[PDB]
Write a protein that binds this ligand. Structure first.
Ligand SMILES: *[C@@H]1O[C@H](CO)[C@@H](O)[C@H](O)[C@H]1NC(C)=O
Ligand SMILES: COCC(=O)NCc1ccccc1
Length: 339
C-alpha cells in the first residue's frame, strides 16, 4: 500500500483547483526511486472538459481520492510480481490535469480549469527531496499511455531541475510505456494543436527550438521528440496499440489487412535506432503496472529482464539484450501476447 500525500504547495492543483498529490511507499534500504505517471486521455476545450468532469471526475479532482493504493506490476514490492525493482521507493502520481502532463496554466477569472501537469511533476520532485530523494542514486520517471508521453515531455526537465538545485549525483532516466504514437493517415494532431493552446502546454526546449512557434504539437510524437532528449529513455510499445487503432478508426479483408501490416511495419521502423526498447507484436494497451506484466516475452526475454539488462548497460551484454522488437507482422504472432 502506498499512502496519499496532498501537495503542501496548494497553488499546484488539479483541473478544478483542488490540490494535486502523490502516493508514496518508502524503502529505507534503497537509493532507487520510481516515480510513475498515470494515464487517461485528455480534454482540449471547455465543452469536452465539462463532459469529462461529469463522468471522469477522479481524473480532474482530488476531492474523492482514497487514502491508499496498492502497488501493482512495477510498483509492487514483492519479488515474484516485480523481479526488476521490488526493493525501490515507490511513487504513484495521479493524473488530474487532463493535459498529457504538459500544462502550466492556473485557474483564474479567465480560465475555468487549471492545467498544471508539468508543474505537478516539478512540485512532487521538490517535496520528495525532503522525504529521502536527496540520497538517491537513480530516479526513474515512468508512465503509461498519456503518462508515457508525459515521460518523454518531462524527463529532461526533471534532470535539469535536480542539477540546478545542487544534486548532480542523482541519475535521471525515463521509462515510457504505450505513449509512442504515429501521426498517420486514418483508416476511415488537431486535438493536440488545440490542447496546447488551451493548456499553455510546454515541450522540451531542444525539440521546441527545432519545430518553433505554432508547431510544438510535433513534440508530442515519440519518433520526433526522442532524438532531442539527453536522458536515457527505455521505450515499451505494442506494435498494434489499441489506442493508436482507436484514433485510426479501426475496429478481415485485403484493405484492412494491408493497413494493419503497414502500421506494425512503420512502428517497427521508428524504433530501429532506439537502443533500449521492448515492442511485441500484440493488440493491447499499457503493461508496466499490470500484475501479469512478467508474462510477455520477445525473442525469449521478458520485460523485467530487459529492464534489468538496461540497468547493467548503464554502469553489449552477453545473453542480456536491451533492444527487443518483434519482426512478425500480425497481432498475436507472438505466442506470449496478453490473452
Ligand atoms: C508554489 O507553486 C507555484 C507554481 O509553480 C510557484 O510559483 C510558487 O513559488 C510555489 N510556492 C512555494 C512556496 O514554493
Ligand atoms: C491515444 O492514447 C491516449 C492518450 O492519452 N494520448 C495522448 C497523446 C495524444 C496525441 C499525441 C500523443 C499523445
Amino acid at each position: 500500500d502506498l499512502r496519499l500525500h496532498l501537495l503542501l504547495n496548494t497553488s499546484v492543483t488539479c483541473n478544478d483547483g483542488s490540490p494535486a498529490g502523490y502516493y508514496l511507499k518508502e524503502s529505507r534500504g534503497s537509493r532507487r526511486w520510481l516515480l510513475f505517471l498515470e494515464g487517461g486521455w485528455y480534454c482540449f476545450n471547455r465543452e469536452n472538459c465539462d463532459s469529462r468532469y461529469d463522468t471522469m471526475r477522479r481524473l480532474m479532482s482530488s476531492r474523492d481520492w482514497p487514502r491508499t493504493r496498492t502497488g501493482t506490476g512495477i510498483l509492487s514490492s514483492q519479488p515474484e510480481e516485480n523481479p526488476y525493482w521490488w526493493n525501490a521507493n515507490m511513487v504513484f502520481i495521479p493524473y488530474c490535469s487532463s493535459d498529457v502532463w504538459s500544462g502550466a496554466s492556473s485557474k483564474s477569472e479567465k480560465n475555468e480549469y487549471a492545467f498544471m501537469g508539468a508543474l505537478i511533476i516539478q512540485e512532487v520532485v521538490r517535496e520528495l527531496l525532503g522525504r529521502g530523494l536527496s540520497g538517491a542514486k537513480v530516479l526513474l520517471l515512468a508512465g503509461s499511455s498519456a503518462g508515457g508521453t508525459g515521460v518523454l515531455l518531462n524527463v529532461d526537465r526533471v534532470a535539469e531541475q535536480l542539477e540546478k538545485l545542487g544534486y548532480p549525483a542523482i541519475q535521471v532516466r525515463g521509462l515510457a510505456d504505450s505513449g509512442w504514437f504515429l501521426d498517420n493517415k486514418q483508416y476511415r494532431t488537431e486535438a493536440i494543436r488545440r490542447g496546447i493552446r488551451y493548456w499553455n502546454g510546454v515541450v522540451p526546449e531542444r525539440c521546441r527550438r527545432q519545430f518553433q512557434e505554432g508547431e510544438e504539437w510535433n513534440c508530442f510524437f515519440g519518433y520526433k521528440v526522442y532524438p532531442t532528449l539527453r536522458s536515457p529513455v527505455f521505450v515499451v510499445q505494442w506494435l498494434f496499440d489499441e489506442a493508436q487503432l482507436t484514433v485510426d478508426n479501426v475496429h478481415v479483408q485485403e484493405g484492412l489487412r494491408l493497413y494493419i501490416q503497414n502500421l506494425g511495419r512503420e512502428l517497427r521502423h521508428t524504433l530501429k535506432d532506439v537502443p533500449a526498447s521492448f515492442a511485441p507484436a500484440c493488440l493491447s494497451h499499457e503493461i508496466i503496472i499490470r500484475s501479469h506484466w512478467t508474462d510477455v516475452q520477445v525473442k525469449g526475454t521478458s520485460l523485467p529482464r530487459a529492464l534489468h539488462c538496461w540497468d547493467r548497460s548503464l554502469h553489449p551484454l552477453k545473453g542480456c539484450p536491451v533492444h527487443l522488437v518483434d519482426s512478425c507482422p500480425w497481432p498475436h504472432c507472438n505466442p506470449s501476447c496478453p490473452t
